[PDB]
Enzyme design. Sequence first.
Site: not given
Ligand code: GTP
Ligand code: MG
Lengths: 438, 348, 53, 425
Positions: A9-10, A98, A139, A142, A145, A182, A205, A253
């Site tokens: 995921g992102q 997703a 995450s 997401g 994620g 979330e 975060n 470990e």
């Molecule tokens: N620390 C940090 N948090 C992130 C980042 N990108 C997204 N988030 C956090 O991740 C959560 C959203 O999930 P995403 O990772 O963007 O979504 P995804 O896993 O790509 O899943 P999708 O719904 O398909 O887009 C939120 O709480 C965001 O603040 C990042 O680059 N750094």
């Molecule tokens: Mg995403």
Amino acid sequence: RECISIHVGQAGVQIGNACWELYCLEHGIQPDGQMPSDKTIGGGDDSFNTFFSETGAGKHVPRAVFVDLEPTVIDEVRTGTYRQLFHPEQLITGKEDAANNYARGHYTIGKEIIDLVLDRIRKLADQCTGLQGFLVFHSFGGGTGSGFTSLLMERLSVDYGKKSKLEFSIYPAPQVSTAVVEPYNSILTTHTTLEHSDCAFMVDNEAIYDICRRNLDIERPTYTNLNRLISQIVSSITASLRFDGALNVDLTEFQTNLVPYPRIHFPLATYAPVISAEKAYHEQLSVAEITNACFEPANQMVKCDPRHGKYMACCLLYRGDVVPKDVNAAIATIKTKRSIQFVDWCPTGFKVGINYQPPTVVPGGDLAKVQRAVCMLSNTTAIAEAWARLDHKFDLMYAKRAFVHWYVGEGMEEGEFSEAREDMAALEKDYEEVGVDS
Amino acid sequence: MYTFVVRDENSSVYAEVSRLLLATGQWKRLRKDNPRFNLMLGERNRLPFGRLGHEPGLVQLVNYYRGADKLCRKASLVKLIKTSPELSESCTWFPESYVIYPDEREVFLAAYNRRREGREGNVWIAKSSAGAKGEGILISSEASELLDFIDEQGQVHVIQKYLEKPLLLEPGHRKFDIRSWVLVDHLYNIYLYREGVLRTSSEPYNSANFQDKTCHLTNHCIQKEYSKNYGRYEEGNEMFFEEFNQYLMDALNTTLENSILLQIKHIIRSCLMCIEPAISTKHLHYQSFQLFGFDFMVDEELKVWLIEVNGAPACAQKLYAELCQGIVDVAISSVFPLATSIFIKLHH
Amino acid sequence: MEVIELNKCTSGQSFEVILKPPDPSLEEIQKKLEAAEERRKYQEAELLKHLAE
Amino acid sequence: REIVHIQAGQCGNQIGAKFWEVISDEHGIDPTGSYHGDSDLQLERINVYYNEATGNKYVPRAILVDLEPGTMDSVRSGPFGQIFRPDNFVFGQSGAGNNWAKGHYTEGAELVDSVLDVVRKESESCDCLQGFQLTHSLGGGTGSGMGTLLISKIREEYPDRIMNTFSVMPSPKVSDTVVEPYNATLSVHQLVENTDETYCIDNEALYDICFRTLKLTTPTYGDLNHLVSATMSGVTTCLRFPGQLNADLRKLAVNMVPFPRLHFFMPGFAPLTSQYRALTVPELTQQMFDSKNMMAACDPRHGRYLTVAAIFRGRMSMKEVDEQMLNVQNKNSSYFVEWIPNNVKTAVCDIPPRGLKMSATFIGNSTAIQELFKRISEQFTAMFRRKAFLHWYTGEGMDEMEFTEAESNMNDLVSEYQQYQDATA
Ligand SMILES: Nc1nc2c(ncn2[C@@H]2O[C@H](COP(=O)(O)OP(=O)(O)OP(=O)(O)O)[C@@H](O)[C@H]2O)c(=O)[nH]1
Ligand SMILES: [Mg+2]
Ligand SMILES: Nc1ncnc2c1ncn2[C@@H]1O[C@H](COP(=O)(O)OP(=O)(O)CP(=O)(O)O)[C@@H](O)[C@H]1O
Ligand SMILES: Nc1nc2c(ncn2[C@@H]2O[C@H](COP(=O)(O)OP(=O)(O)O)[C@@H](O)[C@H]2O)c(=O)[nH]1
Ligand SMILES: COc1ccc(/C=C(\C)C(=O)c2cc(OC)c3c(c2)OCO3)cc1O
Ligand SMILES: [Ca+2]
Ligand SMILES: [Ca+2]
Ligand SMILES: [Ca+2]
Ligand SMILES: [Mg+2]
Ligand SMILES: [Mg+2]
């Protein structure tokens, strides 16, 4: 003994990007993969080879897989500064995401891409002579994620039963969050993933956001800021796998030192010092000061109050100019001033690791170069506070069945919500049993 | 416009505090479960401290210190005084106490026998942190009866030496206790309300009969219920500091400040400074203040003894207005400023 | 206050200081995913029936 | 993340046309479909609404539908008329006589397959179809009856794609015929079942904004449509430009719609325009949440917000935007449901709409929207209880029962909004 990284995921991908950039800086690997200091061309079993494989042409390639259900984020890796580092098979993207829906990532879309992912992962594993396990970045919030990661963890348990699995998980915060659902996704993924993870490092975060605000003087932190800070903590945690050392040299470990009971496998991470690069001259913090700073909630990756919990294990990981005598002195001092209560069935002690190479920072970045730093990993019942927070938000929406139809529409059953929530309730009760008096 | 929530409908103090806040015109009360508040007037039990300080854009304050129960439960207060380096086990202002489970049983019995052989007074009292409103208290010079009484109960008890030589108010030859109110704000300043109250027995003190617990228990409810002389000497069996100081001057040629309040301020300071590292919110994501009710005894040597600390005290009626205003002034508006101090700041 | 297990090397050292003594199979996963897909198919079938009406 | 746009009937094609003029301008596309912009941000997600043709031409992924050719002749004559794909004009000759039954069952039925062929053609060339957006009025016959028929057919062919509408609600204040409440009620009945997201654009609110706020004594459809263009630009900003959210219609639906039926959104906009002093972020936020800036004639203080999405456009302090939004919720916490934590989401885009240094667009899922449906319901009932003007519909083969059913569904909808307006804890 190789280690494979999986970024889902992102959040997982962008944090992965940050981490591998940092790893490259730390090991002297250029964006084209070349590593001048590496005198054994085309192979070797040095420590950094735990994370990097080698081509005959001398390229050092991350043992990593990037997975996202849409392509925009991973495309930046493909076209970015370190594009030459990776082979395309390591970078996996679908066409649509997703939609912030756990069930869509786990059931609907997960089922269509999971075998492709497993195949790419298997390709990496075949290269390994003694694979120890996986590091999984994602995450909570997401759809990908949460949902896809939990599916992937189930399947990794099936396909590599022996192997250790470590998590780096971004816990959701309203300041930088994306979706209103979330909390749902978080509980569903924690429930499905609990049995399949040996040790999980949660990063709230909110905590990172405030550290960036407060100590880096950034008015409104971006993902880049958060990720550079987070990558510093991740590098602290994985440095023992990537460098010569005696503490935490294999994934097992982490479990052995930090997790006395399998379900209670979420150590609190605390990092110091975080100093702004813009500050032209700095007072360098001593071993005593950074070690003391480790017991300040304002430096924790998850805001909570360890004074009102109990410790099961404590680990101190120093980088830079630090010698054992100073650590023992500082710990002696800190004991007399701090509320540090261990559970009665655990030794009141610290496992300490010192790596002499000071932390590395991204040039022109927001973080200052310091001469010594420490990351503390402590398994404290206090982190249950975060679960309590999350569960409460869940309870609020679920009482009205808000948004549930989006999940049920994906083929999930309503029962999985309550099953997951019951599991979380049990988790909380476990923390209270281990940590609370009458 | 600041916002606040109310989660303890039974608190008289914060009912008044809430009322005042509303009356300022700059505070709005929300429904108890609305998370978007500046101030939580929290519930007495299981206050969800873990959910405070996670609301973006909201400075948050609560009217309790997480951890302060260590001072405000009798068993845990005994343990605290016995195991804290800063409070000697031999600390002179706390009555020899032991924690007994229905455990320091053999320790208590040992000291008891030591007293018996030495001809000394051996009248002890058993009280439960469990017990309430004068229920579950036993005064006896026989250990057997005390322990039998405790074993018949279900929760932890404390056995603490009865103060056989209390200071007696004249006329009436009667016992009393002192209640001090202490406010600790978010900076951990310690503010002693200038007005204390004496809660008095309206029955003559009788050391030959500890079963009649009317002239032995100061408790307002107990006096109001069982004493047929309730209110004879002072209104509601409550004597205030102006009169008490005057009495000390006329009867003993001394003042309330010199003979008693120095000791009280010392005890308050010792107790709160002891736990400050454990409960302070100076670097926390949320902040605490709290109103405490310290209860003291005075013996015939004008020595002050700490009896107990209350985490959720009520107030003397005639004092409610002042104290509550003070709470809004120094504990609330200090954090949330609006658009001659009644407190004694105990320095440290 | 005891220091134990001190290990040293050119890149750093480590030690311990003590202050005081004291799964579902592949088939089941496949079935879960197929059950969810089936529920999606049933719901879609209901919709297409309704639309046909 | 392609979107296929469909505009049906007179109202639908007029607001649809203004939409394409406005966003073509924002993306630097001239009336000939050629790009003449200065920023790459203009092109990064241009594909969401535009196809590429030879010579680096950009052609709207838009389908123009009507049962009579007048308005579409007007579009082709218009400023950006030349930009549309000629094959994507689908029209009949008969018209629908402001009659839902004619659009939905008789006249419209004949023309529907041709529209679907064009829809199919556009969808099949999409890398990954996000879904459909339809512009239409609910008070006429084509946009209302045929438009809903089109939505029904599209769902059948693409059940897994998002359906989004811009639906213009009738008002006696801006009325073409007395049967508008019939047409709208029948229409609303379809929308509850077959759309994921509907923007309620109330002609009563548009008129009121024009009359009271913009000081226009006698508002024309031109003026109302200027407001509608601004609103459509705003609520599609996150879809059209690069941002932090990765915005699309599915995430909007997932996050804004807690219960499937309750997907009717109240749009808002600030500043309301027809000055050279840009607003301050506090002014933007205040005006944005003000009832007088709502495009549905509903008082938000008469209900509670289920969810909210906000879009700020222009160069401004994001810190100040956060502060102001957090400020609004904290000050007015009563009007936001407490059983949906953090139900307000804010986004920011650096590129301001034309003629403004900065703007704010508001998308609310509020229970107060029930006031709109109630209003329609009353107007419906007043006629239906005496069966007034029904022969226009029964002459087209409809039965009274269908009217009774639609009235019931809308009344249920109102009951559901009230039900969640009263839910606590
Ligand atoms: N620390 C940090 N948090 C992130 C980042 N990108 C997204 N988030 C956090 O991740 C959560 C959203 O999930 P995403 O990772 O963007 O979504 P995804 O896993 O790509 O899943 P999708 O719904 O398909 O887009 C939120 O709480 C965001 O603040 C990042 O680059 N750094
Ligand atoms: Mg995403
Ligand atoms: N060790 C002791 N020696 C002498 N008198 C004692 C005593 N312990 C308690 N008392 C008497 O018992 C009364 C009530 O005792 P205690 O304070 O422990 O009960 P309680 O906590 O229910 C009342 P409060 O909560 O108002 O203090 C005191 O006011 C005092 O008169
Ligand atoms: N806001 C707005 N409303 C319109 C416009 N044209 C028509 N209407 C409204 O739409 C309804 C009539 O529907 P119309 O679109 O003209 O008929 P159709 O062609 O059969 O769909 C009435 O409520 C009119 O007030 C327009 O350009 N803008
Ligand atoms: C109340 O919580 C939220 C409400 C809405 C959204 C919206 C998302 C994630 C979007 O993708 C989105 C946002 C938008 O504006 C903020 C959109 C939009 C989609 O279509 C056009 O306007 C996200 C949320 O957490
Ligand atoms: Ca090598
Ligand atoms: Ca396993
Ligand atoms: Ca055909
Ligand atoms: Mg008490
Ligand atoms: Mg018309």
